[PDB]
Amino acid sequence: MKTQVAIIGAGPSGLLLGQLLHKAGIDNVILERQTPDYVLGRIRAGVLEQGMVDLLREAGVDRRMARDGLVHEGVEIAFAGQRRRIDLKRLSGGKTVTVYGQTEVTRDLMEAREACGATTVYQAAEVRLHDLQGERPYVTFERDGERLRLDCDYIAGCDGFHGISRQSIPAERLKVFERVYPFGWLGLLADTPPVSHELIYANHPRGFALCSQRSATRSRYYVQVPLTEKVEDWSDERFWTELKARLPAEVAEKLVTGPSLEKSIAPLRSFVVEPMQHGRLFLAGDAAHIVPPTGAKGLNLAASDVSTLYRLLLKAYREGRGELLERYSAICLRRIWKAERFSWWMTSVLHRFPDTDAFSQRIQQTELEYYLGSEAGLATIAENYVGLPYE
Amino acid sequence: MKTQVAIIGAGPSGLLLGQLLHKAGIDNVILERQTPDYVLGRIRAGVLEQGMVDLLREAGVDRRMARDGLVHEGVEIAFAGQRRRIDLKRLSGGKTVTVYGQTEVTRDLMEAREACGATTVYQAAEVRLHDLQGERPYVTFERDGERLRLDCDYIAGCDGFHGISRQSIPAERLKVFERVYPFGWLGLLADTPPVSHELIYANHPRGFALCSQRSATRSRYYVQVPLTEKVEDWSDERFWTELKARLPAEVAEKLVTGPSLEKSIAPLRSFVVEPMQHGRLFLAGDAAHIVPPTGAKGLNLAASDVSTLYRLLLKAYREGRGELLERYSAICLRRIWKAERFSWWMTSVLHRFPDTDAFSQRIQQTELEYYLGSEAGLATIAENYVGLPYE
Numbered sequence: 001m002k003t004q005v006a007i008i009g010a011g012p013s014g015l016l017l018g019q020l021l022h023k024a025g026i027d028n029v030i031l032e033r034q035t036p037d038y039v040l041g042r043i044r045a046g047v048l049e050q051g052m053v054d055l056l057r058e059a060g061v062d063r064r065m066a067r068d069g070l071v072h073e074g075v076e077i078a079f080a081g082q083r084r085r086i087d088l089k090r091l092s093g094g095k096t097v098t099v100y101g102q103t104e105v106t107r108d109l110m111e112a113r114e115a116c117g118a119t120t121v122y123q124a125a126e127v128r129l130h131d132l133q134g135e136r137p138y139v140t141f142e143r144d145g146e147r148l149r150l151d152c153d154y155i156a157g158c159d160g161f162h163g164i165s166r167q168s169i170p171a172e173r174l175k176v177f178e179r180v181y182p183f184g185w186l187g188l189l190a191d192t193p194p195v196s197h198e199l200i201y202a203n204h205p206r207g208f209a210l211c212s213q214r215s216a217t218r219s220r221y222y223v224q225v226p227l228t229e230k231v232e233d234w235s236d237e238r239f240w241t242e243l244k245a246r247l248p249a250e251v252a253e254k255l256v257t258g259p260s261l262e263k264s265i266a267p268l269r270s271f272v273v274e275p276m277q278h279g280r281l282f283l284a285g286d287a288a289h290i291v292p293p294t295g296a297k298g299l300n301l302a303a304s305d306v307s308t309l310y311r312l313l314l315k316a317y318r319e320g321r322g323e324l325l326e327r328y329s330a331i332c333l334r335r336i337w338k339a340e341r342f343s344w345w346m347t348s349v350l351h352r353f354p355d356t357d358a359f360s361q362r363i364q365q366t367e368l369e370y371y372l373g374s375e376a377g378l379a380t381i382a383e384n385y386v387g388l389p390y391e
Numbered sequence: 392m393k394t395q396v397a398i399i400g401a402g403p404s405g406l407l408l409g410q411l412l413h414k415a416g417i418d419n420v421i422l423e424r425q426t427p428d429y430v431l432g433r434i435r436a437g438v439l440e441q442g443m444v445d446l447l448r449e450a451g452v453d454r455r456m457a458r459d460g461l462v463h464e465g466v467e468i469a470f471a472g473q474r475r476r477i478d479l480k481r482l483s484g485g486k487t488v489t490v491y492g493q494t495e496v497t498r499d500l501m502e503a504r505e506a507c508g509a510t511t512v513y514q515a516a517e518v519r520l521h522d523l524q525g526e527r528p529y530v531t532f533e534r535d536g537e538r539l540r541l542d543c544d545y546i547a548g549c550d551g552f553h554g555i556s557r558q559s560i561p562a563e564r565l566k567v568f569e570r571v572y573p574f575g576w577l578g579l580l581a582d583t584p585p586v587s588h589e590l591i592y593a594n595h596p597r598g599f600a601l602c603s604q605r606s607a608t609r610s611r612y613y614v615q616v617p618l619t620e621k622v623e624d625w626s627d628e629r630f631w632t633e634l635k636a637r638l639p640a641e642v643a644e645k646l647v648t649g650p651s652l653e654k655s656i657a658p659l660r661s662f663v664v665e666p667m668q669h670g671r672l673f674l675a676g677d678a679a680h681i682v683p684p685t686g687a688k689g690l691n692l693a694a695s696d697v698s699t700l701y702r703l704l705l706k707a708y709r710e711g712r713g714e715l716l717e718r719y720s721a722i723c724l725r726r727i728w729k730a731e732r733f734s735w736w737m738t739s740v741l742h743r744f745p746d747t748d749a750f751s752q753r754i755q756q757t758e759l760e761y762y763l764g765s766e767a768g769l770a771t772i773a774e775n776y777v778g779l780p781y782e
């Protein structure tokens with residue numbers, strides 16, 4: 001087969017890029033290693049920034065989101081003793097965030113694509129990338145036990161952390177920046193009404209807790225755990241007691257509990273690769289960078305990479321301005337690094353780190369007290385949380 | 392002898408407290424271990440916050456400062472590539488900082504005291520504190536080889552880091568929080584015109600540099616150095632070349648050099664003791680807490696402790712409200728911890744730390760880029776630099 005742009009991975013990144021390109025008249029084929037329900041089984045993200053909200057609208061996939069997503073104008077931080085609200089809307093100059101599940105976003109994009117009849121190959125096994133620096137790169141994959149070749153002009157690597165894209169670039173061409181945190185988040189998806197109309201981030205001596213939601217009758221809760229914990233060790237009951245133990249008493253008392261729909265432990269990491277391209281291959285989303293979940297930025301960054309890639313390819317195709325594609329990595333990395341710093345910061349102030357001396361503990365408290373206390377400090381949080389402008 | 396308030400240390404803290412109390416009608420005696428010129432030989436501080444400026448006025452010792460100190464409405468940060476100005480005045484809502492040497496402040500206070508004829512004992516050796524928890528505490532000291540006893544109602548420990556005050560409290564009564572940085576600052580006092588009308592903090596790959604001043608024909612420069620360096624190893628020339636190597640080219644080219652008046656290496660440290668009192672003993676300034684020089688806060692914090700102690704003692708003496716003295720430590724520590732966090736932050740973003748991975752380096756850069764870039768971030772710096780409100 002032959003196409004314009006070949007996309008590796010049928011996650012939100014590949015799907016959204018695919019959608020935007022199709023609608024713009026640029027043919028693209030998506031190659032996914034797994035099945036459509038495997039993809040749809042990932043819970044992940046709950047919070048979208050306005051830019052991603054706008055991109056979905058632009059891909060013409062926002063009906064359901066407009067109906068079903070919840071607009072939030074504030075978030076709360078609870079730290080030893082109190083509960084503080086950050087008014088996002090007023091502090092960011094009128095911006096908000098939207099709660100809409102990653103699974104939901106993914107489902108909407110898969111439907112839109114299916115309708116349009118754009119090509120998607122599920123269970124594409126053994127994807128391999130070839131001739132990245134030539135004029136004519138191609139992708140090989142196996143469909144059954146048949147190896148097919150897809151010819152294209154450009155490859156978008158939208159295959160997440162463990163994809164093949166990043167792996168296909170000469171190791172010597174990339175500079176890696178990684179931070180591994182000594183803790184993960186145990187998440188619990190329950191068909192219970194959320195404890196608050198807004199999110200609650202909690203710094204507690206026993207460790208971080210987060211009260212999030214999916215809808216009015218669907219909640220998502222997380223507690224920080226050591227990397228050595230196995231989820232088979234966390235019954236629903238154990239989860240509920242522990243959560244309750246990390247929250248403000250008035251919050252724990254109002255908490256409606258119930259059986260889990262899903263439970264999983266996610267390890268926290270910081271990761272950036274520079275540059276994010278090679279020849280005719282362009283990395284986007286988790287393939288190029290990972291942020292700890294704390295600042296609700298991963299999917300939001302994939303969206304900014306995708307927005308940048310899409311606009312650059314349009315220009316190349318419709319305007320014959322292929323040279324601007326050289327500017328892809330410079331553009332995305334300005335945004336990445338600022339989102340990674342916010343994410344690191346959020347992570348360092350709300351989590352309980354092992355082997356922390358008295359000083360470092362006290363500074364942790366003071367940062368909270370300072371930032372939650374000053375109009376300037378509050379504003380720093382608010383403008384980062386809502387998302388910084390797209391370039 | 393007998394007095395009301397005995398003060399240990401004839402540094403800025405003890406002198407200013409002494410001055411404020413004398414003028415208010417509360418007799419006080421100051422006991423200093425060293426001579427008056429030894430004290431006057433310390434260079435130290437260049438930057439005063441408006442609150443300390445106001446306190447000096449209130450002690451009626453501001454003639455010379457009003458004439459000779461320089462009002463600064465901005466500071467600059469130079470980091471890999473650029474030079475950024477923080478407009479303090481506009482970002483803090485109209486506040487500025489004053490450049491007036493610690494030595495100058497000290498000289499003015501010593502003169503004012505001498506004029507007033509309030510008691511000061513220089514070369515008071517072997518000071519010892521007794522009966523802190525009684526109704527009648529006293530101080531013993533040796534004048535020659537004669538041990539005298541001073542009876543008083545209260546003791547103010549204004550004896551700096553190494554004083555006897557802090558040492559006199561049951562170790563078990565205090566909680567210590569300390570951070571030792573792996574670097575010091577080599578300072579150079581030169582009778583040369585400063586390179587800029589405003590301060591320049593520089594983050595350079597070879598390490599931090601600071602361009603400060605004392606007057607229009609008096610400059611103070613510092614470069615970060617390892618703790619193993621001995622100043623005997625830093626000729627003036629060596630200092631000048633190294634400084635020049637850490638600054639923006641346009642700044643290094645305009646630099647007027649000359650022989651040093653003083654050269655000294657100061658190690659950086661973070662230190663707080665909780666509580667800051669015991670019985671009839673009250674700690675103030677460096678006796679209770681140390682901040683790295685980076686945020687220009689040490690002397691400024693001594694001033695806030697002293698302002699708090701003075702107002703509490705007035706109330707106790709003139710209003711018979713001795714109970715409020717219990718609130719001394721609570722009041723001061725709110726301010727200390729916020730100044731210590733700013734000081735730590737400033738220190739972590741401008742200095743070159745050994746064994747720093749690629750990630751941590753990049754985040755260091757991003758913090759600068761973020762904070763120097765956002766109106767909210769700039770404001771956070773500005774309100775902290777000028778000094779947060781006194782409680």
Ligand SMILES: Cc1cc2nc3c(=O)[nH]c(=O)nc-3n(C[C@H](O)[C@H](O)[C@H](O)COP(=O)(O)OP(=O)(O)OC[C@H]3O[C@@H](n4cnc5c(N)ncnc54)[C@H](O)[C@@H]3O)c2cc1C
Pocket residue numbers: 008009010011012013014031032033034039044045046047048102124127158159160161162163164165185187266284285286287293296297298299300301302
């Ligand atoms: C606990 C948790 C909470 C989160 N919360 C949020 C939040 O609230 N807001 C937010 O912004 N972000 C959050 N994120 C981040 C967000 O979920 C991810 O950034 C997002 O999944 C990235 O999308 P992606 O399309 O780049 O990658 P992925 O979602 O990983 O999808 C990549 C696709 O490529 C496929 N693939 C992999 N290898 C190959 C191969 N060789 N060939 C073919 N296909 C392949 C995969 O099967 C997958 O379908 C969260 C993440 C976690 C873990």
Ligand SMILES: Cc1cc2nc3c(=O)[nH]c(=O)nc-3n(C[C@H](O)[C@H](O)[C@H](O)COP(=O)(O)OP(=O)(O)OC[C@H]3O[C@@H](n4cnc5c(N)ncnc54)[C@H](O)[C@@H]3O)c2cc1C
Pocket residue numbers: 399400401402403404405422423424425430435436437438439493515518549550551552553554555556576578657675676677678684687688689690691692693
């Ligand atoms: C390089 C450098 C730069 C600085 N820059 C600034 C700046 O720009 N702005 C700012 O705010 N701060 C800055 N500081 C901090 C500031 O200099 C100190 O915080 C200030 O000296 C504290 O005053 P103090 O009176 O508490 O103590 P000190 O100045 O230490 O004086 C204490 C006095 O007590 C005496 N003493 C000690 N032990 C005894 C004893 N047993 N008996 C009797 N007397 C005793 C000492 O001899 C001394 O005279 C800087 C410090 C350094 C090192």
